[PDB]
Amino acid sequence: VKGMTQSPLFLPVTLGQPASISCRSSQSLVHSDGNIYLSWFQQRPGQSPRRLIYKVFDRDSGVPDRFSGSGSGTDFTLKISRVEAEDVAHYYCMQATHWPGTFGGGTKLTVLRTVAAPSVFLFPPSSEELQANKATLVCLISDFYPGAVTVAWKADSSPSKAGVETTTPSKQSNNKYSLSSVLSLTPEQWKSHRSYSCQVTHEGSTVEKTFAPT
Amino acid sequence: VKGMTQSPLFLPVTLGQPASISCRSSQSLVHSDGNIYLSWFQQRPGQSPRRLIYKVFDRDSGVPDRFSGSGSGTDFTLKISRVEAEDVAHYYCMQATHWPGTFGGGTKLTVLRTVAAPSVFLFPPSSEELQANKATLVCLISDFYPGAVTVAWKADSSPSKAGVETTTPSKQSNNKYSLSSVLSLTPEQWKSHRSYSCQVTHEGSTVEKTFAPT
Amino acid sequence: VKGMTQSPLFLPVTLGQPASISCRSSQSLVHSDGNIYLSWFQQRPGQSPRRLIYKVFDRDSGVPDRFSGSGSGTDFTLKISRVEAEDVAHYYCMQATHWPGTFGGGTKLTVLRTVAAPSVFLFPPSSEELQANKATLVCLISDFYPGAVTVAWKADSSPSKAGVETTTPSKQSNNKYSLSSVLSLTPEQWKSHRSYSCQVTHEGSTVEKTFAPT
Amino acid sequence: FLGFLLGVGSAIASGVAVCKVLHLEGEVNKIKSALLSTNKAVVSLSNGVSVLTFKVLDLKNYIDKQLLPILNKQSCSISNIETVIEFQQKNNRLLEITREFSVNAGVTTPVSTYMLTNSELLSLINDMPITNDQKKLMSNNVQIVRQQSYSIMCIIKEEVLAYVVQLPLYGVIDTPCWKLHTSPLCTTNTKEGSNICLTRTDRGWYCDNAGSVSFFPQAETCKVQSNRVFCDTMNSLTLPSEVNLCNVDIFNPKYDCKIMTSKTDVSSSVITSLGAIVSCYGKTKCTASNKNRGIIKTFSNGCDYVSNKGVDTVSVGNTLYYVNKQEGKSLYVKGEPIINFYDPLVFPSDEFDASISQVNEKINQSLAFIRKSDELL
Amino acid sequence: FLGFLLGVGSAIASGVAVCKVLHLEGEVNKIKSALLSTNKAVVSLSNGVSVLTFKVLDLKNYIDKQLLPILNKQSCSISNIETVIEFQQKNNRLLEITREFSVNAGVTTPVSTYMLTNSELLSLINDMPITNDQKKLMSNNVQIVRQQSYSIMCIIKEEVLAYVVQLPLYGVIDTPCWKLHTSPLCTTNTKEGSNICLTRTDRGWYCDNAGSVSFFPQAETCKVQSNRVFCDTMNSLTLPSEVNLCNVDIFNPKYDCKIMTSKTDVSSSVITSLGAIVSCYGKTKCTASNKNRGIIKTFSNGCDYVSNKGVDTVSVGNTLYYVNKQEGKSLYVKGEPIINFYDPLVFPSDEFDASISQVNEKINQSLAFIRKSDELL
Amino acid sequence: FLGFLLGVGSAIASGVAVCKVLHLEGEVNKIKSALLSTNKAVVSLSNGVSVLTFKVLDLKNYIDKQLLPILNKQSCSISNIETVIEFQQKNNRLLEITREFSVNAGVTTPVSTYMLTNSELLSLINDMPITNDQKKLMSNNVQIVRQQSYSIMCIIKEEVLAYVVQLPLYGVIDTPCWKLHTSPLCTTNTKEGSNICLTRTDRGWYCDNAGSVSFFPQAETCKVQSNRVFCDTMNSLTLPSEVNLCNVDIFNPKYDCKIMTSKTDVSSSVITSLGAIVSCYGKTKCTASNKNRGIIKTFSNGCDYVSNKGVDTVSVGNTLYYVNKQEGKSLYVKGEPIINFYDPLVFPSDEFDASISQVNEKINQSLAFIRKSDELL
Amino acid sequence: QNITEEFYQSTCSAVSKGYLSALRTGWYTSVITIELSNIKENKCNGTDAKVKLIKQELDKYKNAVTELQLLM
Amino acid sequence: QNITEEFYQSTCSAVSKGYLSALRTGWYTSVITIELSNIKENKCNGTDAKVKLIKQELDKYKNAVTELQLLM
Amino acid sequence: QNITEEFYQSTCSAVSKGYLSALRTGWYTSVITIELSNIKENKCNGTDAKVKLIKQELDKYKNAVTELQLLM
């Protein structure tokens, strides 16, 4: 019953600059044979995890020497001397001394860039879906950074709880993100109200986009 | 040839108040098996000693928990947390590491009370004893505390050395002592002198009781 | 290849006064069996060395108690508490831990006395040696102390290098020394010049003795 | 007695084979690579046989991470005495094993605790594909299999020391087994000489394993823990079950009971599991005694047996035997001694590995010799 | 030769009995209570048999008064490192005993110093209710007592380790005793075969102890210290004093001397206490040599014996024997070898436990055959 | 079988003599004087024999230079824990020696590493005035020299402990030598009884050394290192070279080969160096098996031999034997077993050390009986 | 009440009949390894007590390495 | 000067006649005890050299206790 | 390729003929000495932990000395 804590859970990096991830164990990981069995694994999206480090320090075959591991007791660190483009992936720490091993929460690596205010657009449900007896209102938040952002929906100035779903894509080649917020209502409820507004909070200002169907 | 020193040799206590006796050994008492075999024994008047503490710390079966033992090296201590009436007795420390064991001088427990000046009386020899061809003069020191007291005999202002014997009873239910000092002289020597005086020194003043037979 | 340094190389002592010689090793002399094998030897003129000290401290059979050895690591000392006349000889330190042994430079012991200025004499070559087709000029330096002294030869005020040889006897019973400086020249070169001078520097002044053959 | 028939065998042959396979250029590197990231692995060696492998202690990591860095600092500072003690603790494991190996030609039996501790041995037992009955058997008697185990010192190559542990793997368990003790049986005639002695030679352990019985002639080769008899099949014979007939009918035609003959009229005693057999002959004193009461029974010049119930010691002449304090019921089977069925002066008195058939044939042949040389005169 | 006649016995039977009594629910508590205030006491066990008991080490006090209080629970700093080394001292004795027992099946002989130190052993000797003669005997040869002692591991219950030291107490002391060496006696005929060899088999130690002689057939079972022969009676026989008659007159009618017959024409040597016996046969080289002079005497193909005074080594063929450097007078008793008293083709040549009477009876039967097969034809 | 014929000799007699010469009043002082200034010397003792002497450890210097001055100060400060650890290191050597000596009566074999380190042993090898061939031999087999060495504890006198190391010096090396394994050879007639068995008794090692052959009957007394047979000449027999004839022609008239006869119809196996011999009799199962393929041959009830090349194990009855996997050519020489040349009811079936000439003479004597008891009738 | 013994006076033998079996019948092989480190000793010219004791223990370890070289 | 030896050539044997006896003929049993203490269980945290060493020695002690818990 | 073996079926024996010899034939005696020091214990009444451990180790040393004084 060991707890593995990775820090931080979201790491913005700059290419050519070092990065480091801390992994802390709830118990001492020293094994009875004098070794410490802590491993560091890399996982790119859509792929299985690939081991980079074993026994805290030893580097696995086929790993560039830019990766290094260090640590003892209950504190360990994975270090990347010069972060490259291919280093953008997930990284996990795993204790292996005590059966059957434990994994940390995991760390996502992304590229640090300047703050970019999003472009906000709003889209009413189409007539065809209104015939289909449902209504969806789509709010688009395009080309922003960082990924943290708040979206609120108001139907006739009433904040909506549930009935909204948010999607974010992976970091693009301009180092920006997007976001789609879809609000679902029945056509009766949609025709029952007049003002529909999407309110966006980010490191720009607070921006609302609205329209009046019925 | 181990010397066992008990301290103090006369311990006045107050009931409900703690008491402690220190016992010092001339040699180290550590045994080859890793133990220290020192016992604390209690003796009531007319009774045989009973073992209360063995191995410095361990209490014998049926020993009240108010008694405790402590110590190390060459210094040891017996402690009574709350001294009761039954605790007034003699207490001995006994080393048992080196054959065949040694006893300390012994410690007498007595009841502490306020200072009481004695009542001093003097009694000449009776006529019948004077017919018996000896003379005894009795000086009585009644109801005093503490037991320390000095008695001097003067026959025509001449202090007498030897020819005097002193008796002291045990502590009474008023926590006081008594004392009888008997001076023995031949009837010829008794008739040879006139003034006979008993001089008492205690925690009062110096007090003389005198009489003039012949 | 162990280096043994003796200090000093010339030790003037006073009879009845202590003396000490220091011997330093370039390497640690501790042997694998826990011992240090360093020996002190005496060598009188014309005699073979005699061992006095073994195992740094142990004195050999028939060795005066004045002689003692001390030291550790790479520093050692031979001590004579009360120097007598028979102690005037050479002394050598030898370490024996590492095969096959090594000897220091050596130390000569002489008797310290007051400064004595020498008596300087000059002797021309005889006529018979002039027949023998060689010429020799002798400079005598009698009854001086200390042994340090400089002799220079000038033929018509020209200092001569080589062609001169110097001899010194051992310390006499007046604690003084002597010295003979012989300058060798061919008879042609001898007859070619006029002024011949021996210049002596010592703890007196600078003194020249000269003569003019031809 | 018996045991000269066993035949020789190599006790450490399997471990020798593993060592010889381990003497390859990359075999050390195969073990090194497979154990580079774990403490335990299975390696298929070049011969095709897989072997379990342990990395019990990693002195290289200790020396090169906590000892070597402290030593080299351009100043030989140590800053704490603790380092030398920790060194003498980890080095302790190595020092004991190499000492023990240097006194036993590399073949140490039993396996020491320092060489292979019981916790690792328990893991080794627990992780083999064998019937769980045998797993429990080896688990509850780990020091017993230890005393029936061997050690073989293999190699010290590139950066690792390796040696072979040769455990036993028991294939026959929980089958009927018994021990048989024999004592010399002699004639008790009043004459001083001319005595006749006959003795059964089939002493030892008898274990039924598969259709037949494995016979162990030496009482040393088998260890006993209160129910179970641990034996070695290599020093054993394989005989038909008809040897069992020798206990009831020694003249049986279904098997030939091996015996020996002597003229050695000598008294002796044999302590059995639940009693004692006493062969008292001549004018020797034979006594069964109890610790509380004292002398309780005397032996009347014959082959006798006494139970251990009320008997605690036996003294024959000047020899003192202590009875085993084991518990169990003892059955006395009466019957006249067999030696009375032969007459002297025809009985061969010097036989050592003979049998009922052998002795009977010699007696029959000798009697034919006596008769055929007299019918002619 | 002899030694098969001794009979089996349990060397640790008494220690086994003590262990079995020690396996009682409250017997451990009885030992704990009796030793509560002292390091030594004798405890009457449930069967009525008392046992002396020592309390040699008290790990409990050191651990639970000076080490356990500082350990618990999460603030566990230890200034004055010395404490751990002190643990290595108190724990030292425990570890050594645990190792020795775990590699010897619980039976260690001799008893090691770690198991029982000499000071405690001497206290045990002086606290023995035995004869002062035995007390002095066991005091002057304490290592011999060690080497004829056992240690048996009994129980591990509530808070104490306990094991049994099984010392021997010698009931036969300072009695006449002697050693007998025998060598093969053979014929010196020219043919390689057709030779006859005869040998005494009753070699070993003979100790006179009570009305008869205790005979130890193996020279291994007895240790010797310059006067005294420390032996074990359990591996001994009890024979009448007439066995001594076999040394002077082997044809005596009062006893039957046990011998063996062979055709083994083989040269060998037997070193005795004050010399050596050499059996030289065939074309073998036999030489007695001195280290100062060199070769000093040659052996003329027979049973010979030479004193150790002027002799320092013996060489028979390729075997090099070193003579004993003991002091004492050696007496050569002349007399023709016995083997000349029989003629071949009537001598039974394969006897291994036979005697004078046995061979004579067989020869008488064969010679009566020779006479009765000629009276008829 | 054979081995009782060796005759006894003192293996540590030379070391015993050195101890006795070490037991004189001033001999300890002579050793002290010779070692007073060095760590090593040669000392001629009172008997005239020179001996090497070592001063391996000087506890006198360590105690009186680093321990006693610090202990006695009138203020028992130590100020530094290191001192106790350094003591327990220097003390360690002596304590380890005491353990072995105090449990082995002063006779320790092999010599332990603490008793005599390998570096010191190698120095001793380089110093003995022997042939450089012997120096190289003892250098490459240091553990072999250990296993054939002894240590004897001599004296404790004035201020020095001294004990004897008895190393072996090999005088016969690199001579032709061979090993001989024998297995019981019996008749396989269809009848259960009346079987005849015949076995060679001269099993063991045969080393040609000087005109004759040294014969070692025990396979344990000689150790083998892949080419060398390390043996001890004292426990050896010296026989003419014609004993080699017994391997090829056992009926040779120039020597009498020793054999034994039995009715012991028993199946067994004998593992040799490069194969295995199987004696299969009765209804016993005999199988040669391979680890890869499985069962590869069945044995047809006789004396058989199989090479170790394609065979990895042998199973007879319930006994599992592991074959040696050494390399080398194995030659099967055909020829009918000798046992078929004798007929039953005339064959003596109880012989244990007999020979070809002995058994033939007994059969001839029995045949003379059979013929002369019928010529008359 | 589990082990029984019988004595036959005719043949003078005793059979103890209450035992169960455990026969060897085979060998089980395993390999134990300890990772070592080659030592190129320091040339420290300092005779510190702790360092000299470290050096003595390291000499013991290297000695044990050599004593382990006693293979066949 | 106390031990004498005689060789009988007829039987080819030697007798050394100067010895005294010490025969066992009996056993005396005694019991040796060591008071132990069960420790369940230290919670000493931290891989400090002093702390790690004391904990490892305690592990050695407990290992010895369990190794002894066997044996009949 | 150096050792050869022959099996003779007539006598049912096997001879391995590829070995070479090393026979003892002789003993060499040597003497090993250790110089000791007689110790008369200090009566220091200081119960310091280090000093007490020194006392214990010196007691072990003298106990070994006396146990070795029991020569033969």
Automatic annotation (TrEMBL), chains D, E, F:
<keyword id="KW-0812">Transmembrane</keyword>
<keyword id="KW-0165">Cleavage on pair of basic residues</keyword>
<comment type="function">
    <text>Inactive precursor that is cleaved at two sites by a furin-like protease to give rise to the mature F1 and F2 fusion glycoproteins.</text>
</comment>
<keyword id="KW-1234">Viral attachment to host entry receptor</keyword>
<keyword id="KW-0564">Palmitate</keyword>
<dbReference type="GO" id="GO:0046718">
    <property type="term" value="P:symbiont entry into host cell"/>
</dbReference>
<keyword id="KW-0732">Signal</keyword>
<keyword id="KW-0945">Host-virus interaction</keyword>
<dbReference type="GO" id="GO:0055036">
    <property type="term" value="C:virion membrane"/>
</dbReference>
<comment type="subunit">
    <text>Homotrimer. Heterodimer with fusion protein F1; disulfide-linked. As a heterodimer with F1, interacts with host heparan sulfate. As a heterodimer with F1, interacts with host IGF1R; this interaction activates PRKCZ/PKCzeta that recruits NCL/nucleolin from the host nucleus to the plasma membrane. Part of a complex composed of F1, F2 and G glycoproteins. As a heterodimer with F1, interacts with host RHOA; this interaction facilitates virus-induced syncytium formation.</text>
</comment>
<protein>
    <recommendedName>
        <fullName>Fusion glycoprotein F0</fullName>
    </recommendedName>
</protein>
<keyword id="KW-1015">Disulfide bond</keyword>
<dbReference type="GO" id="GO:0060141">
    <property type="term" value="P:symbiont-mediated induction of syncytium formation"/>
</dbReference>
<keyword id="KW-1160">Virus entry into host cell</keyword>
<keyword id="KW-0449">Lipoprotein</keyword>
<keyword id="KW-1133">Transmembrane helix</keyword>
<keyword id="KW-1040">Host Golgi apparatus</keyword>
<keyword id="KW-0175">Coiled coil</keyword>
<feature type="disulfide bond">
    <location>
        <begin position="280"/>
        <end position="286"/>
    </location>
</feature>
<dbReference type="GO" id="GO:0020002">
    <property type="term" value="C:host cell plasma membrane"/>
</dbReference>
<keyword id="KW-0325">Glycoprotein</keyword>
<comment type="function">
    <text>Major determinant of the species specificity of RSV infection. The trimer of F1-F2 (F protein) also facilitates the attachment to host cell by binding to host heparan sulfate. F protein is involved in the entry into the host cell through the interaction with host IGF1R. This interaction activates PRKCZ/PKCzeta that recruits host NCL/nucleolin to the apical cell surface where it can bind fusion glycoprotein F1.</text>
</comment>
<feature type="disulfide bond">
    <location>
        <begin position="222"/>
        <end position="231"/>
    </location>
</feature>
<keyword id="KW-0472">Membrane</keyword>
<dbReference type="GO" id="GO:0019064">
    <property type="term" value="P:fusion of virus membrane with host plasma membrane"/>
</dbReference>
<dbReference type="GO" id="GO:0098670">
    <property type="term" value="P:entry receptor-mediated virion attachment to host cell"/>
</dbReference>
<keyword id="KW-1162">Viral penetration into host cytoplasm</keyword>
<dbReference type="GO" id="GO:0019031">
    <property type="term" value="C:viral envelope"/>
</dbReference>
<dbReference type="GO" id="GO:0044178">
    <property type="term" value="C:host cell Golgi membrane"/>
</dbReference>
<feature type="disulfide bond">
    <location>
        <begin position="246"/>
        <end position="257"/>
    </location>
</feature>
<keyword id="KW-0946">Virion</keyword>
<keyword id="KW-1043">Host membrane</keyword>
<keyword id="KW-1169">Fusion of virus membrane with host cell membrane</keyword>
<keyword id="KW-1180">Syncytium formation induced by viral infection</keyword>
<feature type="disulfide bond">
    <location>
        <begin position="186"/>
        <end position="197"/>
    </location>
</feature>
<keyword id="KW-0261">Viral envelope protein</keyword>
<keyword id="KW-1032">Host cell membrane</keyword>
<keyword id="KW-1168">Fusion of virus membrane with host membrane</keyword>
<comment type="subunit">
    <text>Homotrimer. Heterodimer with fusion protein F2; disulfide-linked. Interacts with host NCL; this interaction plays a role in viral entry into the host cell. As a heterodimer with F2, interacts with host heparan sulfate. As a heterodimer with F2, interacts with host IGF1R; this interaction activates PRKCZ/PKCzeta that recruits NCL/nucleolin from the host nucleus to the plasma membrane. Part of a complex composed of F1, F2 and G glycoproteins. As a heterodimer with F2, interacts with host RHOA; this interaction facilitates virus-induced syncytium formation.</text>
</comment>
<comment type="similarity">
    <text>Belongs to the paramyxoviruses fusion glycoprotein family.</text>
</comment>
<keyword id="KW-1161">Viral attachment to host cell</keyword>
<feature type="disulfide bond">
    <location>
        <begin position="177"/>
        <end position="207"/>
    </location>
</feature>
